[PDB]
Symmetry: D2
Subunit: 125 residues, 4 copies
């Protein structure tokens, strides 16, 4: 069992109203689906990622990341978002992330290919 | 078959001398191993990610991302890197990425949790 | 007069308890001092930046940025932070930013030179 | 005199063909003009920034940053870019940066307000 396997597994919501459904494996795997409340997206998209299954015991957070490519049976936004952040456990559990969203571009437009932002996920709302 | 499944699959090297070994699935999956030439790392780490298996035909790049959590049987750096970028095919194929590397921290130090940088991968060196 | 010259000018506080004192010029200049509640810093540091003195009238925010180099008469942290974001006016005015903090490194360590994060500034606290 | 005042002062060119003209002051100031070869820009824009005027003597780089707001007498792109990076001296002097480019948006679109990228400046081309 990963130390935070049970803490991470389940349904999470961010500040935009997006929904992240994840299963944490004992081996450090994250698998699930993402539904974005914003952007060129509809319905659910596959996600995959990794987490630290043996975090420090000094009250540090648990490092994790995941990827969504924005193609499903409904739409293709020719883009991928990666979230990098940490899981913080306790009464008000949260995942605090920063993300990079790259779109496919021509070489001429590649300077303008990547957005950056930050999402906070909680188990309520 | 994903349009760039055969182009992405294989062994890639970045400017630091790191090695990325990836298999691209027809469904948009990326699986493989990463070996970092720098940092608190040794030997290979599991990676997982996603790519756009049906990219635009206008000469745009192919959006992709992947995650490594820096725990293996040798070391645990209590961190995760996510790479977000695009695959550009042709004689001099490349994957151009930006990355976020988050370490687990206490809440007091969380402002200092995340590095950002950029890696370029090629099929030679 | 810049459209938001009077809105931006004054004293701002972020979520860490840092204090930003700024004067907005009619020409798009930002000048002032920054005091960080965290990190290798004490007392005030000079800041300089720029803002859009003629923003869109469609309810968009006002784009701005500024720099602090972390050298003053007390300490030198051999680093510089740049904040990039937007000013949003009204009852609960805010400046929403993302920042890059680069430290001077050797060429070998340059991959690890730059932190990224996000600060929200308000006129109260 | 700042240790790298003479090294930084002058004309720099990046990989896109943009031109950065800067004067470094003894007090840590950077002032000058920027001309972008790409994007919603024409002619020169005012820049302001800061650098570490007393860097480490261990072969570390010199931390610096600067801001451009993309308004001049010709155009207004309602955006600001901040560059954060380091100056590396010697036969092949360079400024290695990462940047954040924020556009003014409505609150609904603020998740999509900020691009990230990387520019390398040299004294030739």
């Amino acid at each position: 069992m990963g130390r935070d396997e049970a803490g991470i597994t389940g349904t999470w919501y961010n500040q935009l109203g997006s929904t992240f459904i994840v299963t944490a494996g004992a081996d450090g795997a994250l698998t699930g689906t993402y539904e974005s409340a914003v952007g060129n997206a509809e319905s659910r998209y596959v996600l995959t990622g990794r987490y630290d299954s043996a975090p420090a015991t000094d009250g540090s957070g648990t490092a994790l990341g995941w990827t969504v490519a924005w193609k499903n049976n409904y739409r293709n936004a020719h883009s991928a978002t990666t979230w990098s952040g940490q899981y913080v456990g306790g009464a008000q559990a949260r995942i605090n992330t920063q993300w990079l969203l790259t779109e496919g571009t021509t070489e001429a437009n590649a300077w303008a290919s990547t957005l950056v932002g930050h999402d906070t996920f909680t188990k309520v709302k």
